[PDB]
Design a protein around this ligand. Structure first.
Ligand code: HEM
Ligand SMILES: O=C(O)c1ccc(CCl)cc1
Ligand SMILES: [Cl-]
Length: 393
């Protein structure tokens, strides 16, 4: 028998402090039923990992938000990668893998690192800054749109579009309905930038279009694949870098360890991804009756995976509520797991690494010096404002 809970994981109260409710979800059983939204939930590491790694049973082509594409129209044409199952998923995924490949990181690393150092130097001249607007947002905005090959005009639509995408995975609450109400201009801008003539040579977008002659994707698939990078590629890194800075601000002992060995920068960022889990949740839809954690789930049911809870499950992690930059982080699910595991993770890690390297080399202290304000989104966890004073090294 499955426990029924009234917790709303998409309520502002939950977003404001999810950790007690996440423990309640884990401790109630391996599988729960959320009466508020008529979905199954899994919050322990073991079940989240199992669901992610059985894409045949727990599919993505019926949507990875609450909405079931077999019942309702998607709010935008489905993603060819996120909202596809194998085998249709496989070739688009291979293209994005090569576009965002280990070999590709070599071409952009020097520029990304220089921009990170420059940003930290600029911020140190001001001393008192907002680590969200002035750092977590400003740094990705200074590198990623250019790496995509976007023109300058209209970039102000990118963060609003991403906020809309991530709110739209949620249930039809006020956050989602308001986002969709305001979406038209952001949708129009993003769709237009996905066309081949609008993407500058050598950038990620042009490279996607260049793959349309190998037989992996056709020309009419390239715009939606560019759309995937313009959906997932910016706001995630904003909240990842914001999480890392928030962690270093709250845990000065870890900033001190990072300063003493800047080569810990990449793992410090990975640990921030585990600790905050910027992408909190995704859904799957069952394609058959299935037994999961001793429970029987029928066909066509939505299953909500709590990635952030899995990343704090004491059944899997020692001292899960501690930020530890030398933790063995391998196996966290902050980037997912299995066939859909974040195809952009090398870009995310590159940005996080070079930013934390710049802080490690240039900053002696990060002190919160103003009211912290949280940003509410149905899928993303992060801050609206993080006033800090940076002391130079
Ligand atoms: C800290 C930053 C990031 C986090 C926490 C994150 C998180 C995730 C997660 C959890 C998934 C799995 C979705 C699922 O299983 O349904 C995913 C997939 C994906 N991510 Fe990331 N992401 C980040 C950065 C990026 C970046 C920078 C890009 C592109 C430049 C990107 C592009 C994608 C794409 C295209 C997919 C779909 C892959 C597929 O379905 O095969 N992400 N991401
Ligand atoms: O294909 C997309 O549009 C897409 C992919 C991944 C994510 C989660 Cl980072 C969001 C949107
Ligand atoms: Cl769109």
């Amino acid at each position: 028998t499955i426990p029924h809970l009234a917790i709303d994981p998409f309520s502002l109260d939950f977003f404001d402090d999810p950790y007690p409710d996440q423990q309640t979800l884990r401790d109630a059983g391996p599988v729960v039923y959320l009466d508020k939204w008529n979905v199954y939930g899994v919050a322990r590491y073991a079940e989240v990992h199992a669901v992610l790694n059985d894409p045949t049973t727990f599919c993505s082509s019926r949507g990875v938000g609450l909405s079931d594409f077999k019942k309702e129209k998607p709010w935008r044409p489905p993603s060819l990668i996120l909202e596809a199952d194998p085998p249709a998923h496989t070739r688009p995924r291979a293209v994005l893998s090569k576009v965002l490949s280990p070999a590709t990181m070599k071409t952009i690393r020097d520029g990304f690192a220089a921009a990170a150092d420059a940003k930290v130097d600029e911020l140190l001249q001001r001393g008192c800054i907002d680590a969200i607007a002035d750092l977590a947002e400003a740094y990705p905005l200074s590198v990623f749109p250019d790496a995509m090959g976007l023109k300058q005009e209209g970039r102000e639509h990118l963060l609003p579009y991403a906020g809309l995408v991530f709110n739209a995975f949620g249930p039809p609450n006020e956050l989602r309905q308001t986002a969709i109400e305001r979406s038209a201009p952001h949708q129009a801008y993003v769709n237009e930038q996905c066309q081949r003539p609008n993407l500058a040579p050598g950038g990620f977008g042009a490279c996607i279009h260049a793959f349309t002659d190998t037989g992996e994707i056709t020309p009419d698939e390239a715009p939606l694949l560019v759309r995937s990078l313009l959906s997932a590629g910016l706001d995630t890194t904003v909240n990842g870098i914001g999480a890392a800075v928030y962690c270093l601000a709250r845990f000065p002992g870890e900033l001190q360890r990072l300063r003493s060995d800047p080569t810990l920068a990449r793992n410090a960022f990975e640990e921030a991804v585990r600790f905050e889990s910027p992408v909190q949740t995704f859904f799957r839809t069952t394609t058959r009756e299935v037994e999961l954690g001793g429970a029987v789930i029928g066909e066509g049911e939505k299953v909500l995976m709590f990635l952030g809870s899995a990343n704090r499950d004491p059944r899997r992690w020692s001292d899960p509520d501690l930020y530890d930059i030398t933790r063995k982080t391998s196996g966290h699910v902050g980037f997912g797991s299995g066939v859909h595991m974040c195809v952009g993770q090398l870009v995310a890690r590159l940005e996080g690494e070079v930013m934390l390297s710049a802080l490690a080399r240039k900053v002696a202290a990060i002190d919160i010096d103003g009211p912290v304000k949280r940003r509410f989104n149905n899928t993303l966890r992060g801050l609206e404002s993080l006033p800090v004073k940076l002391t130079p090294a």
